[PDB]
């Protein structure tokens, strides 16, 4: 963990590394940032005061008688975290253009497509016939092998 949320959000901006902040839980390991990496990232002069005052509070805690060590270089910090992100990750309006997939008999009037595969359903013959009676319907079929991967591919792509 790191001594402040400010550094965590700063490295979130720099790469996106989700790093937690110490909240007096356990005698854990703490990272700290000196003048070199502060000048590297460009943190405001306000945050240096907070980090140094936390460091001297830990100094007081040590004198009252917990591990703290510092990172010096960007490459060392990259090896320290052990992960580099994949930059942008946009999120769409919804997961799929299909909102509902069901089996009920009363919904065949409103249904618009159907996939078929050998299944143990007592009403599969009935629902398949009823869906096939429509004048313009979107019917897909299985060709053996793995049905789950095909259906998952179809439901992502449709």
């Amino acid at each position: 963990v790191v001594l402040t949320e400010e550094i965590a959000r700063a490295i979130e901006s720099k790469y996106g590394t989700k790093i937690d902040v110490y909240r007096d839980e356990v005698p854990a390991q703490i990272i700290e940032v000196e003048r070199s990496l502060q000048k590297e990232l460009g943190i405001s002069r306000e945050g240096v005061a907070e980090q140094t005052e936390r460091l001297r509070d830990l100094r007081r805690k040590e004198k009252s008688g917990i591990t703290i060590e510092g990172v010096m270089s960007q490459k060392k910090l990259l090896s320290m975290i052990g992960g580099v992100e994949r930059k942008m990750a946009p999120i769409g309006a919804r997961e799929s253009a299909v909102m509902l997939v069901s089996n009920s008999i009363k919904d065949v009037v409103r249904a618009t497509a159907y996939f078929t595969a050998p299944t143990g359903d007592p009403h599969w013959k009935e629902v398949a016939r009823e869906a096939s009676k429509k004048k313009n319907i979107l019917a897909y079929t299985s060709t053996g092998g793995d049905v789950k991967t095909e259906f998952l591919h179809l439901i992502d792509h449709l």
């Binding site: 997961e95 799929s96 299909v98 909102m99 997939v101 069901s102 299944t119 007592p122 049905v147």
Partner: peptide, 30 residues
């Protein structure tokens, strides 16, 4: 648009359906 799928494959892939936030109506045939 909507789709009709067999109950067994819905029961097997219902985790993906709830992970993708899709709506389902199902009748368990015992």
């Amino acid at each position: 648009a909507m789709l009709l799928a067999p109950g067994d494959v819905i029961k097997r892939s219902s985790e993906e359906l709830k992970q993708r936030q899709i709506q389902i109506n199902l009748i368990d045939w015992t």
